[PDB]
Ligand SMILES: Nc1nc2c(ncn2[C@@H]2O[C@H](COP(=O)(O)OP(=O)(O)OP(=O)(O)O)[C@@H](O)[C@H]2O)c(=O)[nH]1
Ligand SMILES: Nc1nc2c(ncn2[C@@H]2O[C@H](COP(=O)(O)OP(=O)(O)O)[C@@H](O)[C@H]2O)c(=O)[nH]1
């Protein structure tokens with residue numbers, strides 16, 4: 060039933076805050092934690108993400124983590140900043156300097172235990188905890204380094220629970236430091252082993268969407284987070300509202316993950332917005348599957364879909380939905396592996412997101428995701444063959460061997476995807 | 483937290499320190515008596531400007547700074563100058579005899595007699611910090627105190643504060659304003675001794691600043707006051723990210739990650755624009771594109787060298803004033819399509835951008851025009867090794883004959899320290915060559 064949310068680092072806290080802003084609006088929860096909705100569908104499964112405090116007030120089951128206070132101070136004074144449980148703010152003061160080693164081994168180790176104390180207090184209040192949900196980036200230090208450290212500690216204490224992450228992948232097109240490939244490669248190895256479901260959110264795709272599709276001349280991190288917020292609300296609809304398909308984290312994993320390491324999902328959203336003409340079910344279906352709507356900069360036609368989950372939101376014709384989902388499957392059947400029959404599952408929700416009467420959310424486990432890990436691997440190797448910028452990491456006690464092993468395992472992940480792309 | 487302690491060593495370091503802290507007070511609205519009416523938290527606070535200023539219960543904003551010199555006449559001007567009420571007496575430390583332009587006297591004979599007192603006063607400042615970030619050390623290469631005592635201080639700071647970050651602003655010698663024949667010696671000795679104790683060093687070529695004041699500001703014979711006010715603006719741009727905050731602000735430590743690919747390769751080249759007089763600036767507004775283009779004009783560099791003949795390992799743009807990313811991105815696109823910006827093959831080519839919205843300030847009676855927007859570029863280029871080569875060559879000419887070496891031996895040094903230091907410089911020049919070679 061209950062999900063415990065964790066958001067770590069600048070990116071993780073900025074996207075996590077927006078996530079709670081959006082679903083709070085969908086569930087009728089105001090910034091004060093009071094309900095002011097017009098439907099019971101909003102409250103039927105609210106306990107998945109919200110604890111009910113005294114006075115019938117709803118408090119997100121969210122834990123905010125960072126090694127510097129800056130970004131979390133802004134969240135607390137943000138629009139929905141007052142809804143979060145004050146005790147669930149766990150922050151240090153030194154920062155991680157965009158250094159995976161600082162988040163994972165030194166600065167983060169000094170803070171991790173206090174984070175686990177908060178996780179334990181939330182989990183203990185769960186009638187039947189089902190898993191955890193982490194928002195973070197892989198290019199920084201705290202979300203990447205301390206985030207993966209938290210996952211490892213959480214798995215040790217709750218090894219039979221599902222671990223789900225929204226992981227923002229770095230891109231030179233939207234880069235803060237040159238060491239992002241190092242931090243990302245080190246993190247992917249952790250995620251391959253210690254998560255069940257990872258939504259790959261590529262800042263390269265988010266930028267391209269804002270620039271090409273939405274015609275935003277100079278996208279900001281806020282514009283990128285608009286797309287992330289919409290995607291996160293879409294892929295969690297089945298967890299938050301009554302439904303038959305992928306209604307919990309474990310059933311989602313069973314339907315989406317045919318092999319344990321291949322659990323990195325390509326999300327998509329339609330319609331792409333930054334308009335009063337509502338789409339048609341055929342238009343949602345085409346855009347939902349269009350590469351320009353994917354949040355991971357990978358061409359689906361360069362690979363094959365192992366599994367797909369589709370979520371339609373709004374009042375529409377279920378008959379027409381099934382016809383269109385069967386249409387796209389029967390026309391491009393070569394891009395769906397034939398050794399997993401009926402690998403495309405579709406869910407419908409009556410409540411649409413704010414500002415739209417109809418929307419569609421895509422979740423694909425495609426072998427084309429290897430292009431994303433290939434990109435990171437090339438950027439990693441270009442620096443690592445000259446051992447450039449490594450002193451930032453050896454200074455925190457890391458050895459070069461650990462980098463070689465992280466590189467090797469991600470190249471293995473790439474080859475494992477290619478194995479099933481030719482099956 | 484994130485406090486930064488500044489240490490000004492020798493005449494050059496002290497006088498540059500005077501210009502910097504004067505400029506800081508004007509940028510933050512601090513009066514010569516330390517009062518800051520805009521600061522509503524009395525006695526303390528966590529504002530951005532508190533990284534450089536502590537606060538007393540009486541409302542005084544005190545620089546987190548120590549001034550040290552082995553003779554008193556320069557710091558005496560601070561004791562009696564306009565900002566004498568700014569510093570507590572114990573922050574201004576002076577001896578009676580200087581190093582006579584002799585690294586050996588600054589590091590050993592004379593320096594050892596005051597080093598313990600200096601460390602004690604630095605400790606007093608560090609104890610006031612709740613999250614000390616590091617030190618900024620201002621000094622010349624050529625002076626006996628700026629070279630010899632700085633090296634001693636840096637060595638001692640590594641002991642007392644571990645790997646806590648230490649940044650340098652180093653004054654590279656120029657014949658137009660040099661005061662000692664042996665400045666090449668002192669430069670090589672201090673560069674070698676400090677190399678392993680410094681995380682990042684910004685060299686300021688006095689000849690580059692001299693030419694800029696002559697060419698851009700039409701100053702016939704620039705004085706130290708002319709040079710130091712320009713240097714202040716560059717230092718201000720570099721530290722602005724620590725003293726102000728903003729949505730588009732980028733912390734100096736984050737630029738550092740990109741600027742230092744290997745510990746020894748930690749000498750960024752700074753380029754500043756616009757340097758223009760009030761007469762030329764009148765009715766002539768300099769856009770983002772124009773000041774950005776100026777950053778790739780070698781005549782505006784802080785160190786004389788030719789980046790067009792080397793390779794880039796990082797390019798950082800620190801804007802301040804009326805600047806938005808749109809105009810920055812457009813300017814950068816134009817520059818790449820028309821300038822020789824060749825990166826090494828193991829580095830990404832993107833430029834890292836920061837924007838501080840607080841506009842630049844000028845001191846009254848200065849030569850610089852007040853502009854609505856400015857920029858300092860920090861690039862890591864193999865070309866900065868030219869500065870080492872010129873200095874190492876002058877070293878070799880004199881040392882081959884052991885000219886003036888007796889002044890150092892007489893104070894306790896050995897020829898082995900000279901050859902050891904020179905070999906370390908040869909390896910440094912070699913390191914800059916290797917990082918520029920393409921990968922196999
Ligand atoms: N830019 C700039 N350079 C200076 C200034 N003062 C001295 N220099 C340079 O510094 C070098 C001489 O070192 P100083 O700092 O004057 O000497 P010191 O550090 O006091 O060492 P001693 O006097 O020998 O004890 C020469 O190259 C000068 O040109 C200054 O105010 N501004
Ligand atoms: N989409 C998005 N990405 C971000 C944001 N902030 C930082 N990033 C990305 O995350 C990486 C930097 O990591 P960051 O979260 O800032 O460092 P951390 O605080 O140590 O985890 C870079 O690849 C950035 O492009 C944000 O608000 N939104």
Ligand SMILES: [Ca+2]
Nearest residue numbers: 153165166169
């Ligand atoms: Ca600590």
Ligand SMILES: [Ca+2]
Nearest residue numbers: 521523526527
């Ligand atoms: Ca104050």
Ligand SMILES: [Mg+2]
Nearest residue numbers: 069070199235
């Ligand atoms: Mg950041």
Ligand SMILES: [Mg+2]
Nearest residue numbers: 492493580625
């Ligand atoms: Mg002197």
